[PDB]
Amino acid sequence: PTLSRAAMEKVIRTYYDGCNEADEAKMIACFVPEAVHYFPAGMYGGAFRGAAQIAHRWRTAVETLGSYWTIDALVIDAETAEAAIEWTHFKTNQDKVLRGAECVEFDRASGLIREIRAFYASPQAEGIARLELGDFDYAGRGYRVTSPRKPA
Amino acid sequence: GMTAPTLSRAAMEKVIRTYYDGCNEADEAKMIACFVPEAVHYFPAGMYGGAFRGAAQIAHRWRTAVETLGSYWTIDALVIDAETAEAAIEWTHFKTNQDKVLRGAECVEFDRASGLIREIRAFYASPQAEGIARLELGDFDYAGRGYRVTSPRKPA
Numbered sequence: 001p002t003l004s005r006a007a008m009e010k011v012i013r014t015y016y017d018g019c020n021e022a023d024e025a026k027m028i029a030c031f032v033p034e035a036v037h038y039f040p041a042g043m044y045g046g047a048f049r050g051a052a053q054i055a056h057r058w059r060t061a062v063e064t065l066g067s068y069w070t071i072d073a074l075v076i077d078a079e080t081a082e083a084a085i086e087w088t089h090f091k092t093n094q095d096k097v098l099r100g101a102e103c104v105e106f107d108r109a110s111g112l113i114r115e116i117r118a119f120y121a122s123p124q125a126e127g128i129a130r131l132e133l134g135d136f137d138y139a140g141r142g143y144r145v146t147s148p149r150k151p152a
Numbered sequence: 153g154m155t156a157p158t159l160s161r162a163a164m165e166k167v168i169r170t171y172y173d174g175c176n177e178a179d180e181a182k183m184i185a186c187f188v189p190e191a192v193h194y195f196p197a198g199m200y201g202g203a204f205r206g207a208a209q210i211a212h213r214w215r216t217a218v219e220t221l222g223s224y225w226t227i228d229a230l231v232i233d234a235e236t237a238e239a240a241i242e243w244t245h246f247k248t249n250q251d252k253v254l255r256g257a258e259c260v261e262f263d264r265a266s267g268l269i270r271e272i273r274a275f276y277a278s279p280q281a282e283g284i285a286r287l288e289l290g291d292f293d294y295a296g297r298g299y300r301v302t303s304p305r306k307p308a
């Protein structure tokens with residue numbers, strides 16, 4: 001089914017408002033129940049599995065870190081039911097700032113978020129052979145895992 | 153007055169794919185043709201000494217990467233927004249000759265007046281660097297571009 005750019009924008013903005021408000025019910029309503037949030041490998045212990053887990057993690061972040069998130073850019077593709085968000089995570093209580101971007105997939109039937117894959121404005125970690133999302137099934141999802149180029 | 157051109161989704165996709173082709177082909181001319189001359193590529197602070205200023209510089213530096221690292225890039229997801237004339241790309245940078253893989257995502261802005269890329273802002277699937285107060289893009293004028301600089305929870 002069709003999902004408009006405006007409908008996706010509304011879900012995304014409601015979600016980030018829910019984050020900033022530490023309002024779990026509000027956040028949960030923006031996702032299909034089994035939604036998964038992925039992050040760079042070596043973060044949060046791995047993926048957040050389920051809308052309730054995602055919401056609890058963000059509530060905890062606000063309470064512990066004083067987290068506040070801004071939507072700095074929002075790219076929405078109504079043809080593919082996907083979006084990308086450039087964001088800032090202000091860890092207020094620590095006087096720290098983390099910026100990044102994330103890809104968002106919607107479930108067309110419900111018009112809700114089914115997956116988020118986040119990336120950071122953080123330099124490549126030294127000595128790590130594979131810098132990719134933690135717990136993400138790259139091979140099963142059809143991503144290349146080995147370079148197409150013949151090694152020198 | 154003026155009317156901002158609406159670029160088609162196909163047009164934006166064509167430029168992006170030509171760009172990535174040019175990257176893999178180490179073809180500076182092909183890459184340069186995908187950008188306005190003054191285009192800037194941003195990266196996480198600490199990477200590549202800062203931003204790449206100008207199409208010719210982006211092209212030269214990726215040509216160097218192919219030659220020295222065996223770099224090969226793939227487009228893993230492509231999100232195109234004809235309302236804003238912007239795109240986002242989930243990508244993989246295979247540093248072939250080092251047997252290393254770096255994945256990430258980037259925001260791409262188009263110049264509507266030419267149909268070419270004016271800016272790329274790239275982010276990585278790399279963990280947060282320890283003890284760095286601000287993890288943000290190198291050389292990017294957050295303040296001047298209207299981005300928040302300090303937490304909205306702090307009175308302003």
Ligand SMILES: [Cl-]
Nearest residue numbers: 143144145146
């Ligand atoms: Cl493969």
Ligand SMILES: [Cl-]
Nearest residue numbers: 160161162234
């Ligand atoms: Cl179109």
Ligand SMILES: [Cl-]
Nearest residue numbers: 299300301302
């Ligand atoms: Cl500010």
Ligand SMILES: [Cl-]
Nearest residue numbers: 095096302303
């Ligand atoms: Cl701050």
